[PDB]
Design a binder for this molecule. Sequence first.
Ligand SMILES: *[C@H]1O[C@H](CO)[C@@H](O)[C@H](O)[C@@H]1O
Ligand SMILES: *[C@H]1O[C@H](CO)[C@@H](O)[C@H](O)[C@@H]1O
Ligand SMILES: [Cu+2]
Ligand SMILES: [Li+]
Length: 218
Amino acid sequence: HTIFVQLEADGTTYPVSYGIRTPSYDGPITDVTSNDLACNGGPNPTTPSDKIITVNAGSTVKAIWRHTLTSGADDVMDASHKGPTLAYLKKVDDALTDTGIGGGWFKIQEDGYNNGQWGTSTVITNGGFQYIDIPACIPSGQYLLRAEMIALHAASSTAGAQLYMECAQINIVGGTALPSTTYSIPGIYKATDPGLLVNIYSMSPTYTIPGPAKFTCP
Ligand SMILES: *[C@H]1O[C@H](CO)[C@@H](O)[C@H](O)[C@@H]1O
Ligand SMILES: *[C@H]1O[C@H](CO)[C@@H](O)[C@H](O)[C@@H]1O
Ligand SMILES: [Cu+2]
Ligand SMILES: [Li+]
């Protein structure tokens, strides 16, 4: 149970919920066919924002995670909630109106299982920071940035995987082109994916991270 509550970009750490469509409730999405998968919603209604955060292309941003909106650095997520972390971008005409539901998404970050250490565990232990590299080669303009943590502690059953995501409203600044291939959310995940329907208690130090291949600048 966790929420992407604030974003650091270009040397500024913005306030809780600034530019981020945060739910007040920290519960999971478990149906990967739901439109709620894009930017949360449904059982976790989100709070609208009229703010857009400036982000330099080619820079690293930091998605900061907390158990609840007012939690501190020792209360990111239950350490049992082992799984991957991921991040996606979608180019949008207007970050104040686009719901993120549908096509246009591309993966820009993923952290799976590395010699016994899960991506979520690293975010928990490093103070709730998920590090995300914004591609250098993409066009300026408005985007949604979707950051995600997936807990797999109950994932050996269908729809047992727990997905926690929020969308930040950003304006990317600074030879440019979008990726050739983009994807739909919902669409990228299926309940039978080998990284979602999985028994993590039988792994020794390959985990197949769900979703499309990460975009790399050409
Ligand atoms: C995810 O899928 C790959 C096959 O591409 C496997 O290496 C892995 O065990 C998991 O099933
Ligand atoms: C660009 O290249 C890197 C590997 O060097 C991948 O992480 C990415 O998926 C894309 O192929
Ligand atoms: Cu939880
Ligand atoms: Li490409």
